[PDB]
Amino acid sequence: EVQLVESGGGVVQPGRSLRLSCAASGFTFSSYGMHWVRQAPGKGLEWVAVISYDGSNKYYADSVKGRFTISRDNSKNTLSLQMNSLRPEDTAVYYCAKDSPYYPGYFQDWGQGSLVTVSSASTKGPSVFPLAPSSKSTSGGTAALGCLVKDYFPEPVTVSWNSGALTSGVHTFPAVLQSSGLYSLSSVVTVPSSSLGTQTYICNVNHKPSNTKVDKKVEPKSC
Amino acid sequence: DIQMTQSPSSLSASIGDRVTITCRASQTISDYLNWYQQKPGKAPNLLIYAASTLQSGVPSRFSGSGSGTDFTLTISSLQPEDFATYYCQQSYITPRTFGQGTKVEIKRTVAAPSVFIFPPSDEQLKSGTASVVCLLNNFYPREAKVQWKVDNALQSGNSQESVTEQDSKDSTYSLSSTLTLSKADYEKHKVYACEVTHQGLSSPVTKSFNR
Amino acid sequence: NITNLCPFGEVFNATRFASVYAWNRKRISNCVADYSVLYNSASFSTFKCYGVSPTKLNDLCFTNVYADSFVIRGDEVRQIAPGQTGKIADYNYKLPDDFTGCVIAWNSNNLDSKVGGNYNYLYRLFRKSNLKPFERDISTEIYQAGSTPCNGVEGFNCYFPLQSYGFQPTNGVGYQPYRVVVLSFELLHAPATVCGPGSH
């Protein structure tokens, strides 16, 4: 199990700097070297840089030769990309990548990703709100319910229902940038119509860059 | 520096199709090429190396060919579980740049949306703002249009909507438009509605309420 | 006329074979040779003549015979058909289109493949130019990857030209080992030097 999680994803004003930290697990970090690869939000994949088996050799992309730098810790088994004079061009999620053997690249093992948002906006947590079941959705065979995560920044939001129990009969709705530079979205669920009189559903959500975690039970307002 | 030009740009194929994506190279990059299927919102999942060998666990209907500046991606029979954006990358040279990316659709048949509406919560009205939500569930194609009526009057720039990407079992979509005013001028009106137009909707359908 | 027997076995049941890019070439002269040993033998799996008789070969006489010897994987056993392309004929062993001779191959998983992997067999994986017919590549330089200069294989865009064959016995037949003997015959305005048995 090659696990690769990373953090540092957050906010930075251009010309100021930050760095990302890719933590390795379940494979010999010495086995071979890593790359960082950057995906603009809903755009193509852009290769960033490579560091070697033995921390000695690094290639970068011509976008990042001059203001970015890559490094790794072979002892605590972690990779790090430091990014100095950021440009709004650099806004993206980032991924660390294993150079799986290929007897020569072929990244099979990716990190979940971590988002660098370069807006000069105050890092704000959400103001989530419930979406009670509409009183005629409950007059049919099914029923509709959900959460409304509002006015946070920046992306993303960990979002689960019933403490991460209901990931069946659901799906969430991607981020929309409001006029205010704020973000918001909603998650919803297919449920049994007459199950709301015993079941008490709740939003398992959190906003990582504002240390926020909230839990919204949804009640069935009908009269 | 070498760029990978991968074509077509997008693709609206359907079930069972034998559709093919191609990748042009800036130089002779003989076999050190890779395809990755990015199930969206998640990280890219590997497809192929040498352009011609699987990776175990990846289903066999995929393959490719080419030994040069031009390569293929062979998908024999599409299921909704191929819905993704498919990428190209050359392992031969460093930088290992990528292609533009190519998206794929499905669905022989049309499906109509089931619309639900959601009024502002007491929680948010106490917060001084009010947002109304209109959800469309289980519909193909994804090009449907909602219109917010506030006391039978049409809105503009008072709402935004977000369409989820294609489901993988029934292959439909789901979008959600959010109409937001302040508690003051949300109290200025009584009836709120979203009217929906779809290919599958025989005639426009509106869901509404009175606060 | 000539009377001394040509030793093929020094190539064919040779205790150890060459590696691809440094293919073993043993010239034959001033002797006689009974090629029946091969085209009745069951031990060979693939065996092709190119412009030469299988049988009246041993009616024939030559100026000398060149028997080539090396070991490749399975799916490239065919890469030594004439005028062909792929990592082998392009890089480390090529017969010309106008080829006159014989190709012989057979499984060596029995011999040349052990557990862990007989990575000691290598092919050539990179080369700036193509390979000439019977050109022997034992050059080990940086393979400059076409973007940046290089001295010593330091880092990227500079590849060690060769590559091992992982020969595990459980591995399939396309990725098994295959000994290969590329026979070859030439003539000249110069005396007959190698005959067959039935060569009057």
Residue numbers in the entry:
A (entry chain H): 1 to 103, 111 to 230
B (entry chain L): 1 to 211
C (entry chain A): 331 to 530
Study text:
Within the SARS-CoV-2 S glycoprotein, the RBD plays a critical role by engaging the human angiotensin-converting enzyme 2 (ACE2) receptor in the lungs, initiating viral entry and infection. To understand the structural basis of RBD recognition, crystal structures of representative group A, B and C mAbs in complex with the RBD were determined. In summary, we determined the molecular determinants of four RBD-directed neutralizing antibodies belonging to three different classes each with distinct features that bind to SARS-CoV-2.
The RBD mAb WRAIR-2125, which targets residue F486 through a unique heavy-chain and light-chain pairing, demonstrated potent neutralizing activity against all major SARS-CoV-2 variants of concern. Crystal structures of group A potent neutralizing antibodies WRAIR-2125 and WRAIR-2173 in complex with the SARS-CoV-2 RBD were analyzed to a final resolution of 3.77 Å and 2.2 Å, respectively. WRAIR-2173 forms extensive interactions across the entire length of the ACE2 receptor-binding region, whereas WRAIR-2125 is focused to one side and engages fewer RBD residues. The WRAIR-2125 epitope buries >890 Å2 of surface area with heavy and light chains contributing 65% and 35% of total buried surface area (BSA), respectively, and is primarily based on CDR H2–3 and CDR L1 and L3 interactions. This includes antibody hydrophobic CDR H2–3 residues V50, Y58, Y99, P100G and CDR L1–3 residues Y32, Y92 and I93, which stack against a hydrophobic patch of the RBD-ACE2 binding site (L455, F456, Y473, F486 and Y489). Shotgun mutagenesis-based epitope mapping experiments confirmed the ACE2 binding site as the target for RBD A antibodies and identified F486, N487 and Y489 as critical residues of the WRAIR-2125 epitope, while WRAIR-2173 binding was only moderately affected by mutations at these sites. In contrast to other RBD class 1 mAbs, WRAIR-2125 does not interact with residue N501 and has reduced BSA interaction with both E484 and K417 residues, explaining its ability to resist neutralization escape by VOCs. Remarkably, and in agreement with its ability to bind to S trimers harboring mutations found in VOCs, WRAIR-2125 was the only RBD A mAb able to potently neutralize all VOCs.
